[model samples]
Target: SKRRVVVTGMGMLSPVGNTVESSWKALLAGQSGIVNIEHFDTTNFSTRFAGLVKGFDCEQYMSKKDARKMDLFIQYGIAAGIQALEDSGLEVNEENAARIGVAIGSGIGGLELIETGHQALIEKGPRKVSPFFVPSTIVNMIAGNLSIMRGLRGPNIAISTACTTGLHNIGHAARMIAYGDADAMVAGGAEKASTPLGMAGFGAAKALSTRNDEPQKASRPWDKDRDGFVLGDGAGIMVLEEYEHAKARGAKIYAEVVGFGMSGDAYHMTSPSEDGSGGALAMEAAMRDAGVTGEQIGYVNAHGTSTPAGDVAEVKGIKRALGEAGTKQVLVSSTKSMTGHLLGAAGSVEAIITVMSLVDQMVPPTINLDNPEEGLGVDLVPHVARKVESMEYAMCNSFGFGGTNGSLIFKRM
Candidate 1:
């Protein structure tokens, strides 16, 4: 028999805010976090704006000495992980520590470190490179470092599935607990992909929006004038515990992880399938896992990254998975409209927003969607958040660069 899983806590460091609650509030208010990049010189760059995290204080979560050993992504992951753990109120005693695990990840790990290391190797020598380079740059270090810090000794793992990294991590963590591998897990993803290389690479691919003058309105998913995704940096973490375990300890349950599904398009490297069939498959699988029909899902936190092809393709996928009537009834919106695209961190951060919508019975808006594409008749809840009397289930969708797609269904508890 499989065990039940529930989200006991969540933490986030998003472009909009440093905490999950604050970010959610900003989303509901339809505030944009995108701004012109000032961290480095952008004079030679095509896209000068990004959704960079603001006012992050490392000392708030870890000691200054310990913080220097990790990359920014790892630091963000650790901070968010600690926040989730503390919010969960699950003390890791000697007996229970082994029953807790961590599953956090990053799509691209420590590009800044790699850049610095390469510069050092060329300018001086390999010996001049920092000793902590490899340990700090690897994708798994977030999970490893988090587990070490929290003393969690079970099922330490990480996933690196492009944009789907965060959702995959949380889904796998749920699977681990369901299969009795662990009683609880801290799972999510973090990313700091706004470095010079990250920007130049994406810009060279023409995958980023070049709306330098009005950064706030750049990421307009479903809107007619939307060009491309804006790169963002942040992290989102969740504490998922076996339902009975959380209940026994009187933990504050947020929502139940009823379903999780993943799929691949195998059609393109960075583009989704034109008809959205690949995404539909993942959504169908998730609904099947939850044993729920499409009509049961009142809301959808779409993978609307403000890209030209990706947004429309996701709508087609949603319609295919949910049916015509279900699509018409479901209130779908992309919070990415405000937060920009956090890449690997997008899934977990949006998942947190999804769960919060269920708790608050309010759906965040897709800001700057003043002029949606013609024939996109779905209720997008544009400009302002919408309040619902009640909702039974909500779905969150995440699709990645490698044609990887994942969908999660959360049931109201």
Candidate 2:
């Protein structure tokens, strides 16, 4: 039998706020993280708005040299991981070090670092580039660095499942714990893809919101005028431990990771299945893994990225998994309406939101959803947070660009 696993700590760096508590408060208050691009000039970019992490001071978390050696995305992950470890109060001594592992991945790693290195190589030959380029730009180094910092010596794996990266990392970590390979895992995702090429590539694919005029209202999930997702960058981390281990340590448990499911579209890399069959299969598989029926779930932190077809397809997927009326029992919302899309970090962020829901008994709203799509009959909890009964179980769904879908079920401790 698999041992149970629960989240003991969480940390976040998001457009809304820095710490998990502050971010949760801001999200519950329906605050928008979208703002004008301040890190770089947006004069040439078609879309000038993003959910950039505001007031992020790397020196507060790591030394200047350490920060400079890491790519922005890796820096975000390391910073978030440090915070999570501090908040969890779980000491990683030599004896327990081998029992602890890390699984942190970014969908896109160090694009900024790559761009800078390439430019230097072009202008001043290969010798001018720093030796830290490879390590700083590698996706796996985020977890590698976090492991070094925390002295975690077990397994350090990294995944790049596009938007599913975050969910996959956490799910994979839970499986490791279940298999008795590790007693604890630090799992999360991060992405820093807000650059000239990053925006242009998505723009060329017509996959980003072009509502630059109203950046705050650009990401309006389920709304009639919804265009596409707004790009964002950040990291979200959580500490997962075996039930007995957490009990032994007297850790403050947030929620148990009960089930995980994944599927591929086998149809299109960018588009969801027309019938939402793949997504439905993933959700059902997750529910079955948790030994719970669709009716038992009280909320779904949807992978609604404020796109037109994407939002509708998710509802269809829900209906296929749960009967139309059965789906109504669950309050579904996309906090992406405010934070935009964190890509690799989306699932972890949403999972954190789901766990928080069980803790606070309040569903964060799908902000800016003033108008609903026609004929799409789904109860979208919109605009503002709503008080709900404490839930014993909740679900989080994230489907990525390659039609890779992941779903996780959480049980309140």
> Model 1, range 135-191, lDDT digits (tens) per residue?
989999999999888799999999999899999999999999999999999999999
**TM-score, per-candidate, Cα-based:** 0.99, 0.98
Residue-level lDDT tens digits of model 2 in 323-401:
7566767788999998999998998888899999989988999999887988776668889898877578889999998
Query: Best-fitting candidate, measured by TM-score?
Result: 1
The regions of model 2 sitting more than 4 angstroms off are none
The lowest-lDDT stretch of 10 consecutive residues in candidate 1 is: 320-329
